[PDB]
């Protein structure tokens, strides 16, 4: 009798897809201010 | 500065002959692994006759052309065939029966 | 009783011997001692010198600039020292020094000596010379310390690598009187022994006219008869030059008593065993070395030259792979893989590790007869013939190589221009059946039959048994045949059938086509009824076999 | 009544206050002559193997090994322990010689595939799983294994069907309703993945796999 690996899961790409949309946007509306 | 002063990590010092370090690539040779590399499909089939020789005659009658099934029906060659599920013991004497006893139609 | 109260004694002595050795950053011996100590058998620290604190700041600079490799750092500072304890260190330092830089200068270089069979050593042994005659003791006296007779080592050593043999021995004998317990001093004697002979020349010398410092040993032990490395001398010279033994029996069994636990014992006991061709006796012997010291690589060289013999590459894969594990720098590491490459027929990798193994020890010279076999195996006779040239320049007295010599020439067609070297071979070991009937082949090969007859006739008393003889039977009696006398060749036809009777059937083939022959002599002698037995008897032999006397026996009783 | 109570209490099953039997096999090992016996050592070995301590379930397991070496009490686990650490070498010197003594036994086929198992031979090692298994019913380490090779390398049409066999005649372990669990939830079929989770759980309430899946 052996145990596999427990399933595990990591950062998706869509997730990571729409932290870098948003982080765009804080990037982009700043400059504007300034 | 300083160098030699430490002693944290395997330095020129801990191995006996300084000068090994000529040679340094014999620690990344993949020495071959014992036994179906001795071939170089064939080296499993030579792997597996190999411990297919551990069997009684019997028992390698029993399994020469041994098939199991996902589910776990049973299916066993007569050189007829003893289809059946495993886990129930009777089945297995029965392909012993008719594999080592004596049947015959006699007219 | 009195054994007891020597294990005792011998505690306290190896507690000495590695203190002071280790403490003199000399490994030869330290290494010996604490082992010999470790297997000793079950039944405050200890530590004196004579320094001064000033001059005892020297030391530490000295000892530690020792071991970080930095010799010559060390004679800079070290050099105005006048304490023979620290004189011995200075030079010590400058040897060394000497000793790495040449295995430095020379690594492509594989063969090492000189044709025929300085300046810079004999700066180091002026200094001694120097030294020893301003110190007010100069040996021959009781109070004589330990770093005095530990000077004499390096003297004795210096001197040998000059080749000023007969003079180092002297020096040697004078630093073991002194000072015992010095095993890397027993190896520089041995290794200058040649033969036996001088063995038991200098074995009386040590009886007789032999005595030590009773002064710096302890007690109940500077007696010859109750001392150890002069048992520990029995076992090594007289088996490892295969000497004549004697004085090492009773010497045997008293060190197995006092130490049951030394892993260099056992090995040196199981390697006896490998040495008298007692494979299975000696495979149980190392097994407990395997199991009791996992990590050893200084004998199992011939553990696994055991198992290339035995077979079982699934055995002999397991130490290729353990082995390795443990580092790839030893001599023996790189040994034991290649036996386990080469029994997997990968020749052209295995011949490479043989060279690898050779490299970092040339005094390895069994790895040459072996670098010359897997060329054999690679059909490159040529490359094989130089292989083999080499192990008998490095030392004439090798029985292997004489013999792998002469078998490379036996593969091709030169018969005679191998029989030097087989006729060479022949006086390392004469007592040898398998030779013997190689070189009668070598004489029938080329038309020597007169002096092929003699040959045989040697190998037929040098077999152990009976059986062996039977190939040799069959074809020496053809060599009587070619001899024009067919009444000769009867006698030994006789002998090799009736091999088989009293072997209860043994029914081989060299006696199938005896029985073959000796039928079809007997229908011309017109005995029918002699001559139909030994159809029958050899109706059990190849197709054309039984046919053959199955025809003659329907012939034989025709006229019966 | 105190001795045979400790005896019986070292084969009782784990993944329960370990720290009881644990009490009990010290109280029986020191009082009593019995401080290294097999069961013992199987029972600490087991414990160590729940708890994945695997260098004491290695050491214990050797050290029992060198005086029995066809123990076959503790040769499963100890075939674990090596396959984890992939010990391969050892793996393969116990299967040869677990071969030439014990042909019929399926420990010995058992070891072999697993060996396959550790140089990534499944396709191979189905085989001898299937070998394993036919020789000894009611093994669950074989018919497990032999699932797992279904499972890891594609075909996972039949791994359910295998899975399932494996609850349906080995009731009472939820280690194979879990891996049904997670198996479905592997094809991102959720809740018979839940259905199987939970029924896992009812089996075994003290298992970090099936409470983490």
Not at chain 1, 3 to 23: E, K, Y
Not at chain 3, 385 to 398: G, K, M
Not at chain 3, 441 to 446: G, I, L, M
Not at chain 4, 68 to 91: H, Q, R
Request: charged share 25%; aromatic share 14%; proline share 2%.
């Amino acid at each position: 009798m052996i145990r596999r690996a427990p399933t595990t899961l990591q950062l998706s790409h869509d997730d990571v897809t729409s932290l870098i949309d948003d982080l765009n946007e804080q990037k982009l509306k700043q400059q504007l201010n300034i | 500065s300083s160098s030699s002063y430490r002693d944290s990590y395997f330095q020129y010092r801990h191995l006996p002959a300084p000068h090994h370090i000529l040679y340094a690539e014999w620690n990344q040779d993949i020495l071959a692994l014992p036994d179906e590399v001795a071939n170089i499909m064939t080296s499993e089939q030579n792997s597996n006759r190999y411990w297919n020789s551990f069997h009684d005659e019997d028992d390698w009658n029993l399994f020469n052309g041994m098939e199991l099934e996902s589910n776990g029906v049973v299916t066993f060659a007569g050189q007829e065939t003893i289809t059946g599920s495993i886990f129930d013991r009777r089945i297995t004497q029965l392909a012993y029966a008719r594999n080592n006893g004596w049947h015959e139609l006699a007219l | 009783d009195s054994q007891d109260k020597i294990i005792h004694d011998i505690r306290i002595q190896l507690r000495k011997a590695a203190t002071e050795l280790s403490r003199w950053k000399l490994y030869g011996s330290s290494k010996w001692a604490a082992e010999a100590l470790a297997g000793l058998a079950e039944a405050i620290p200890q530590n004196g010198f004579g320094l001064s604190e000033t001059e005892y700041d020297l030391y530490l600079l000295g000892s530690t600039l020792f071991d970080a490799k930095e010799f010559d750092r060390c004679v800079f500072f070290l050099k105005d020292v006048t304490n023979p304890y620290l004189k011995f260190l200075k030079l010590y330092s400058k040897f060394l020094s000497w000793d790495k830089k040449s295995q430095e200068s020379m690594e492509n270089i594989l063969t090492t000596g000189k044709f025929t069979d300085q300046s810079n050593i004999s700066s180091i042994l002026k200094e001694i010379n120097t030294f020893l005659e301003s110190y007010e003791i100069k040996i021959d006296d009781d109070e004589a310390d330990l770093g005095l007779a530990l000077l004499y080592y390096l003297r004795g050593v210096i001197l040998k690598q000059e080749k000023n043999i007969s003079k180092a021995m002297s020096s040697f004998l004078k630093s073991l009187s002194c000072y015992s317990f010095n095993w890397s001093c027993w190896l520089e004697l041995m290794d200058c022994l040649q033969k036996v002979d001088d063995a038991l020349l200098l074995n009386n010398y040590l009886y007789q006219n032999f005595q030590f410092k009773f002064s710096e040993n302890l007690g109940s032990q500077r007696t010859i008869e109750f001392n150890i490395m002069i048992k520990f001398f029995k076992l090594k010279v007289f088996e490892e030059l295969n000497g004549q033994l004697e004085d090492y029996f009773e010497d045997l069994e008293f060190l197995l008593q006092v130490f049951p636990n030394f892993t260099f014992l056992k090995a040196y006991n199981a390697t006896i065993s490998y040495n008298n061709l007692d494979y299975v006796t000696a495979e149980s012997r190392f097994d407990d070395i395997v199991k009791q010291d996992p990590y050893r690589l200084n004998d199992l060289e011939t553990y696994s030259n055991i198992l290339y013999v035995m077979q079982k590459n699934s055995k002999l894969a397991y130490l290729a792979q353990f082995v390795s594990q443990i580092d790839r720098f030893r001599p023996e590491t790189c040994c034991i893989i290649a036996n386990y490459y080469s029994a997997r027929q990968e020749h052209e990798k295995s011949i490479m590790y043989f060279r690898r193994a050779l490299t970092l020890d040339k005094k390895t010279t069994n790895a040459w007869t072996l670098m010359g076999h897997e060329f054999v195996e690679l059909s490159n006779s040529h490359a094989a013939i130089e292989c083999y040239r080499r192990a008998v320049d490095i030392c004439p007295r090798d029985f292997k190589a004489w013999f792998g010599l002469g078998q490379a020439y036996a593969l091709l067609d030169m018969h005679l221009y191998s029989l030097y070297y087989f006729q060479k071979a022949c006086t390392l070991k004469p007592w040898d059946r398998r030779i013997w009937q190689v070189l009668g082949e070598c004489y029938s090969k080329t038309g020597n039959k007169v002096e092929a007859i003699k040959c045989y006739k040697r190998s037929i008393k040098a077999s152990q048994t009976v059986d062996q003889n039977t190939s040799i039977y069959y074809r020496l009696a053809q060599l009587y045949e070619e001899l024009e006398d067919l009444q000769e060749c009867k006698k030994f036809m006789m002998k090799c059938v009736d091999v088989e009777e009293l072997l209860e059937g043994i029914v081989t083939d060299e006696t199938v086509k005896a029985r073959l022959w000796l039928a079809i002599f007997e229908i011309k002698a017109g005995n029918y009824q002699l001559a139909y037995d030994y159809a029958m008897g050899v109706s059990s032999g190849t197709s054309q076999e039984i046919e053959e006397a199955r025809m003659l026996a329907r012939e034989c009783r025709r006229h019966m | 009544k105190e001795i045979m109570k400790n005896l019986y209490k070292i084969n009782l099953s784990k993944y329960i206050n370990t720290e009881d039997i644990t009490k009990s096999n010290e109280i029986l090992a020191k009082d009593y002559k019995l401080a290294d016996n097999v069961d013992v050592v199987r029972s600490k070995v087991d414990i160590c193997y729940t708890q994945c301590k695997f260098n004491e379930c290695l050491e214990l397991c050797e050290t029992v090994l060198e005086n029995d070496e066809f123990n076959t009490n503790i040769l499963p686990a100890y075939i674990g322990c090596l396959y984890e650490l992939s010990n391969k070498n050892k793996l393969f010197l116990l299967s040869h010689r677990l071969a030439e003594t014990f042909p019929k036994s399926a420990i010995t086929w058992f070891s072999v595939a697993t060996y396959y198992m550790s140089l990534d031979r499944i396709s191979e090692a189905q085989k001898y799983y299937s070998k394993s298994s036919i020789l000894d019913p009611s093994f669950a380490a074989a018919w497990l294994g032999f699932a797992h090779t279904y499972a890891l390398e594609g075909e996972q049409d039949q791994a359910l069907t295998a899975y399932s066999t494996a609850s349906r005649f080995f009731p009472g372990m939820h280690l194979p309703k879990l891996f049904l669990g997670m198996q479905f939830m592997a094809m991102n079929s959720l809740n018979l993945a839940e259905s199987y989770f939970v029924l896992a759980y009812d089996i075994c309430p003290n298992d970090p796999l099936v409470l983490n899946e």
